[PDB]
Symmetry: C3
Subunit: 157 residues, 3 copies
């Protein structure tokens, strides 16, 4: 059996760079604001994975009032979600992530995100794809207020 | 054979609450403007299912020209779509919905949404996932202008 | 093996019509600005297909920088991407595209887009769905500033 999931996330710019996306530190004039590290790509991916498994979403796994994972980096959260998904009997088919950002340029950093994601999910780098697009200066991303990310995932059981 | 579909919808706030999302009435300071009940979750889901089956979109199935569904609630629209999709020989793999709203909070209402959706599609609740995310006060969702929803579905033949 | 992919694109209105969407010329008071024909639907679809095949994105394959692709139209790019994907051993499962635009009306033009996509991917028209939705005058699409498109694809290996 196969299952599909989808995730979407947005974080706002604020503070000083670098930003962290896909587990990779990217120099930039502004940072990403969040209680968390603000890794919009890993949050969206985590939600797609949890969604395919019908385990809810990242907020449901890591409640605001829960002290356990407060302070954790997003790679840690991805690995723990993944542990809980595998405990339900699933393995990974493949994942695809789309970063929506006017800047910074993501392409040079995409290879390194793929390695980190592949290590965290214990899969082949050929099962992991990441891309980026701008919105041609339109909307909150085009005005440089923040970054959004969409992801989809296919799990096998 | 398995087939994938994707849906997206947006409705604007207007008037007084409550709003209806995933078939669940939720109290709020404003209502959702729409000829229909404005249920963005169910419209996005209906489009994702129609999309997987290559049956077009909710506008093609329910034109303003057809009186049968004028004024029908969105659950009735989802069920008629599901009938057409089943007539094509499909059964449900799984669905995942992502509500994009700064407010109201969706978490406590999601259990009921899952039950209503599972009822409408004749499946187990474990084949239905619903999550939500804010856009951190950015964009028309972040400013509280309206609500958006994305959905993916996997059908089996 | 089955594999999923997702794509998203945006282009801004500017210049004279028509606009070109899914390979179809649609009359409109403005065109879509781009170094290209600005076909958001085909770009998003090309990205979903490349994504499923873990080949990156249209910008990795066809950099706006490289003269080899100067003046290529979006169908030529979709076909070349498809050529590369098939060379990797994949065949088409199905694709679903969602155009997000306040105007012009897409519905009358969608059947032709389906034909063109099916021709370019060498598949049956029934493996290709295209839909449209407005955002109810909200956001950059609602204000008539640009058009967005999301797509998903399922490939078989
Ligand atoms: N309208 C909404 C928005 C999000 N939420 C929940 O609140 C959690 C956090 O939302 P957020 O948009 O602040 O997420 P982050 O990437 O900051 O963790 C989500 O993961 C959902 O559990 C909700 O229930 N209702
Ligand atoms: N640019 C557009 C937008 C929507 N549509 C069609 O119009 C219908 C209604 O779009 P809408 O955004 O008003 O949809 P609702 O969720 O209000 O029903 C869609 O289902 C499509 O069939 C279109 O043909 N062209
Ligand atoms: N923040 C971003 C956005 C896009 N890109 C890359 O830049 C290319 C072109 O982006 P774009 O938004 O102008 O795309 P199109 O005009 O080609 O549809 C993308 O296809 C990615 O390869 C990036 O690396 N960093
Ligand atoms: Mn409408
Ligand atoms: Mn947050
Ligand atoms: Mn561009
Ligand atoms: Zn986040
Ligand atoms: Zn709607
Ligand atoms: Zn484009």
């Amino acid at each position: 059996e196969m299952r599909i999931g989808h995730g979407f996330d947005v974080h706002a710019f604020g503070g000083e760079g670098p930003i962290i996306i896909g587990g990779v530190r990217i120099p930039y004039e502004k940072g990403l604001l969040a209680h968390s590290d603000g890794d919009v790509a890993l949050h969206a991916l985590t939600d797609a994975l949890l969604g395919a498994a019908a385990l809810g979403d990242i907020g449901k796994l890591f409640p605001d009032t829960d002290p356990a994972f407060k302070g954790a980096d997003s790679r840690e959260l991805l690995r723990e979600a993944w542990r809980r998904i595998q405990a339900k009997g699933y393995t990974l088919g493949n994942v695809d992530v789309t970063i929506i950002a006017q800047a910074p340029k993501m392409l040079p950093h995409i290879p390194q995100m793929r390695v980190f994601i592949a290590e965290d999910l214990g899969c082949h780098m050929d099962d992991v794809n990441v891309k980026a697009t701008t919105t041609e200066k339109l909307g909150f991303t085009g005005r440089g207020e923040g970054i959004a990310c969409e992801a989809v995932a296919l799990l096998i059981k």
